[model samples]
Target: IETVPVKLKPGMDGPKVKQWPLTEEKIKALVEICTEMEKEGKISKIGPENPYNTPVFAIKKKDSTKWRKLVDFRELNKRTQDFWGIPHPAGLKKKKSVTVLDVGDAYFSVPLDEDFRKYTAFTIPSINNETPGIRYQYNVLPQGWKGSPAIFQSSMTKILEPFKKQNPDIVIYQYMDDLYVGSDLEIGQHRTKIEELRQHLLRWYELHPDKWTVQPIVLPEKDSWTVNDIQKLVGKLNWASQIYPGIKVRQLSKLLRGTKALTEVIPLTEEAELELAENREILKEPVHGVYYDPSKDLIAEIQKQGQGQWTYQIYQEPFKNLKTGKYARMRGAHTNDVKQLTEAVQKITTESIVIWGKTPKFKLPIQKETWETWWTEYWQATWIPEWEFVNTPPLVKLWYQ
Candidate 1:
């Protein structure tokens, strides 16, 4: 078993947030989550007298409609000592078969010191109507902490170091909780290494039930693709176009304009037939996507279209793959107009970057310094709440406790 407790900056005290607000939906989700986590021994009820109190926020999950609870650890992160030794992405060499494994709630699986646990405390509106607000602190590490990936990666590397050393044939690449295991050996041997990795991770972490992406898991039948299947294929092809230039989906426009029924079969048109065939042929060659490296200088390419629309591409170096291609359609008001642009820009280290062109929304002459300041303010405002607070009861804990 391996574990690492958090380390804070010297003589630093945790910030306390009081009288913050939450939505009914968030409060309900938080109670349900807190009850489940309490049963799992991840979190526990704490007295309000705890010196640390951070706000809790909720965001919609990417693949699902459920609200995921998160701590606003920005203030706490400022006082925490950062880890700088997280390893870079492992080289993907001569891959015959590869499988990606994701550990569910990985940060929460790592333990924390009792003394430091108080610093992870977050407040919620009254859960059981017994108090104005209920407080809980993580017994294990919590999400949204700045140093979490570094800490988790350190412990994960420790756990897998011996495994890699012994089985030198298997390529084990890790980025925080996500792992990519590749093998140039037989499929049987590849599966063996994958299962071994799984067992190693299982000892300390839980795997997401359906998130594993094992290449060649099944053979496809000769049946025609359904509307939903074609949609996703086109969607992925469109994404791949960011790196593989000159690929266009307009030929499939007629085929895409079909009934809303996802499972219904769509007969391919004459134009779509050649296009899909070409796509399959082109995919035979491996196309690269940009890998994020913190050491490299980031490059942001923004092309402002007429009016309030713009598209952006970010990359580290020329001839290398692009990180992503996104288009933002601006709207009225500075907040909403640049909301999409700000969200995308927030994902990068704006402190240092090369911007190629002016954004249409900004009428002033494009300057690196000016855009950096705008990005900083927009990102900082993401958590500053505008919603009013209402006291609510902790129904889940009261009912289950």
Candidate 2:
């Protein structure tokens, strides 16, 4: 849509994972959404094996009874180097008059050129009712594709270039789908700039309603929640888990057995009363806040993602970086990948390889003469000449041969 197609990393046909089992309810939701999308001509009918045939699934939306479709395009993000630079959190401070713009399903607005649209193709279950599972694919920028964010940002950047020059008082920042415009200018001036940008943005959507929409974030308040509510609360608990050490999400969820039900009901129980008090129990422990001594050995094993999942270094009590006071688990690609394995025994060169966890590269190479002499010496050793074989032909004419 930016006049350039999305650039996926080479050698990727796209990545996929097994879909979560579909429920009859989820299938119905898919049928409803897909029917509308097809009528709108946003996605083309799907079939088999296109390079960008992304994997998709339907899950109930959090805190609600609606089904939401999700896709796996994270593999694309992991594989490509292209990125967006977002202004940090401090950008919108107390002084500025700030306004945010919600760009709905941002990537969906852009039309992928015929050549590139194929890579954005994603598969979704065919929403046939009464029975059976049929799937569909995409012709538009996929909502979950890894490259979607970068692709949409690039398209928006080109559109916002002239607008930025026109508004000197307002600083505009786009983070993924949302655009935040703010300035510390007088209210009248700041308000004017906000209106100008909004007018330009709204005017585009007004002209292109078929392609773009403005969807804002409206928080919902619930009196009776579904399993989604408990999961969200569990998610928040997991984030604060370190601060409240002993209380674990898994243990807490054990009390919420109704999580698998269509709607969850987390009733009060004795375990809840117990864990509530012990939530901050870790704070009471006397750790003395002492950091580990720099010279103290903090050991770790170094293994890698290779054939047989080799661990080239298995030296016990491996130390962390003394200067940094920390250890880093480096990348699988880039400088993070270490070609030369270890200081103890780096296999001396010429690559034709497979690693088997701490298993030596190859056995010691003994020449035939050394081997034969060893065989002779083995027989002549005190235990052998001790005549344990009792002159049996077990040694035979075989020794001389």
Candidate 3:
């Protein structure tokens, strides 16, 4: 694999995090995975001499008993420069048959440059008390790095561009690691395209086996679920909502009201269970599919004008800055105007003036009595104090006594 160098922010010191304690089971999992990774040439056991190191931990993978090693890269991510230019793809259009594929071990497939690998060093304490602790650095790119997603996205897009061009009828929508292939043809014909794209991607990257969906994506019903299960369900529903706006956004928020931890057994209320059952019933039908017809033209009705289509018109308008004479870029409807004197209050600072002042950071710092009297005297506004709590014992508290 070709190595890539990560650009880091300048004038930042390397970070070192103290490792936290773990159970014997978790410790065994971490050591076992680290040994397997070292054998696979994904990581190397480095000397315990490096000052830049982060703590490594193991968590259980979904639907599997194996452990997924993770590094706490909060400090490292803060020091790295973000590489963001690629735009995310829009949701796929409704089709006759759709197939989804996930790339296996996407981040680890990409290698990091040798000079920068030292920055990714992670510490794992000794399994027993006899041996000293060990530090291992990743040769391949780790998952939690800040710029890894954009880097992998651009690379994946580059590889799929030619295949997308050659197969014009097959619609391929890719969002980083997940790929969705759409076709209007029969199921067998659609399966060919999925296989073609699978073989094409297999030339460069590996695809997971059970992570794919052929057609008719179904959610299996469970009598009971954990907070984690509900979380995954909500995430999947949110993704599907982009294509089908009929998916209730408000109902999805209600699914995780009392959840505290991921593994906690969620006691689903009667209302929540009914919502889940109704969601399954609604999804089984084919009513909420999103589609587009090229023959139709979009028509919009203006406020005063008759039925017609309107075009966006942007022109330069002089918006004066109170403090500085310099102009700032602004874009909105040309005919927009502001009325009502109550909307004109702006909290101006010494450094900058608020041009599009919608929200105020700080109020006038006036007391409640002043606000009541000011509104009543100016606008004849009748104000009522809803609730107020008085200080219990107004004794003087010492700050530096």
Say which candidate scores most in lDDT. 1
Q: Compute the lDDT for candidate 3.
A: 0.51
lDDT of 3 by residue, 210-273 (tens): 2222223245477777888777777665554543445553554575786378888776677766
Best by TM-score: 1
lDDT of 3 at 124: 75
Evaluated at residue 223, the lDDT of candidate 3 is 76
Where does candidate 3 have its weakest 10-residue lDDT segment? Answer: 312-321
Model 1 lDDT per residue over 235-266, tens place: 66675565456566777665768466888887
TM-score of every prediction relative to native = 0.48, 0.40, 0.43
Which scores higher on TM-score, 2 or 3?
3
Q: List the residue pairs that clash in candidate 1.
A: 127-393, 127-394, 128-394
Residue 279 CA displacement from its true place in model 3, Å: 28
Q: Cα deviation of 117 in candidate 1 (Å)?
A: 1.3
The CA-based lDDT of model 1 is what?
0.55
For model 3, the stretches where C-alpha displacement exceeds 4 angstroms are 92-106, 127-131, 166-199, 205-401
**For residues 10-61, what per-residue lDDT tens digits would candidate 2 score against the true structure?**
7655444434344566556767877777776667764554534454555542
